[model samples]
Target: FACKTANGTAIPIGGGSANVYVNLAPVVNVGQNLVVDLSTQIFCHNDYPETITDYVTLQRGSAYGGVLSNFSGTVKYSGSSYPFPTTSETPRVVYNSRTDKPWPVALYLTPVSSAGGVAIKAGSLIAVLILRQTNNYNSDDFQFVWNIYANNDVVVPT
Candidate 1:
């Protein structure tokens, strides 16, 4: 399931925030590729002599954050202050489910640099694809389809 922020807040460059949620466990087997896409919506709330930097991150679980990933880049704006922009940032992640169990996943974001407190809107999309098994195929050899939208919304369209 995917979940979105209730209110869209402005994020500064070089700064980041956390988005948390509970994920349902999935039956994962060894040797599976998990593809995840990270995208952002950035609004340049600055006049002249100002720039913004947006960053993307992916995390797991609550509190004691587990694994995490980061993406940072610079973006120039020359239009209106509030630009409704859409970015298709796709990052592929391979999962090695050595054990026969499911795990929780989480996502987060940060800004490398936010001049004039540039509004950075960010989100993530995840997809799990099954791979062909080798000689030693486990019971979890079934193809599973799952994804999470930028708003933390989960969708399983198999």
Candidate 2:
């Protein structure tokens, strides 16, 4: 899976033991909204079962607290006609807040519709998050913290 910006910059993740980081510069002003697209080719892989749970958690580092807020996502099923199905309660947003980091959003996924087995699909859009830059930081540099498949035991997507 990957997170992309408007310019088609795909920032990939879920690689085992790979520390992924990139600088998003050019001064994004506070209160300005940024569009982030989450796409996945995970379904193309054969290791994952037909029916499984997928989860994504998004947050910022402690140093950049209050830098991002007001997260909203437009979730999509895999496709149009033969779209991958999900559980009734899936694609739900659950905000997670701890003592340190104040703003964080967790999205849960379950591919299980009432029809039949959830056939996997590739090149599917997971979600689109609208993140508003909430405050200004000194260096204008921060980290995008995220986790996929938090519900399942798989550490990474192969």
Candidate 3:
């Protein structure tokens, strides 16, 4: 299960405004690596609000927002003594890239295999994400604000 916002809670495969979301809960198995993608647990959205739109402005020729790897935030929880590693994705705008289009887009928060699950005590789970826009538009690098997830919910944290 995943967390979402008010208008958009479900991260579907289709593109839209009130759509696109994650499949698994931030909570992981402490031993297995969690994967997130369209075929491997992913979601999509067409129109994003101002905040998200700005950061994800991967329009023609120009880019905005943060890519998957650009997201540099902390997923902390009471169960874990520290924060877990979270990540995002890189979209292709033009071509010749892993992303379907390019940067500055409503991309997926590709939760790459978070190494070292042992840090999180056995059978314990933590779900608290803080993301934001790192810079203007180098379209380069990452999350604490904008649309973020905290386990089973999505929120626009300030």
Candidate 4:
């Protein structure tokens, strides 16, 4: 499924049922990956999918979104894969767990040489998974998961 920001910015997210904006024309070859950083967008309750807990799939495509994999949890579109029940005032989910911080949620394009396979990179089409804790429609204690991959062309600027 896909989701659109309150301002009508269609962001690509996997799992659940939502309409999102995705650019899949760029062919991602085998062994390529798309690395997406949640910091790239601003998410909120308005843009959050209705279901409290569900899995989303991210794949390469344009127009409509695709599913590559799924993650289970409650998430808010604040940016990172943050747990729910944020601070009193903070609106978005923030990554606090040290162990969960470094490991990015990943999705692999199957068969490698598929017709629209893409790789993760600094600015590739990264799939964002937004989940919530309860079906009560509350925006507290949300979490996020990002499926990232490695792009072959981009140089690692260490």
The global C-alpha lDDT for each of the candidates, from Candidate 1 onward, is 0.22, 0.24, 0.27, 0.30
Candidate 2 has an lDDT of: 0.24
Better of 1 and 2 by TM-score: 2
The estimated TM-scores of all candidates read: 0.21, 0.22, 0.22, 0.29
Q: Model 1, residue 157: what's the lDDT?
A: 18
Worst 10-residue stretch by lDDT in candidate 4?
56-65
Best candidate (score: lDDT):
4
Off by over 4 Å in 1: 1-10, 20-25, 40-158
Model 3 alpha-carbon drift over 4 Å, by segment: 1-23, 38-91, 95-146, 151-158
- How many backbone collisions does model 3 have? 33
Sorting all predicted structures by TM-score, with the top scorer first, yields 4, 2, 3, 1
Worst 10 residues of 3 by lDDT: 57-66
* Total backbone collisions for each predicted model: 14, 0, 33, 28
User: Candidate 4: deviation at residue 100, Å?
Assistant: 21
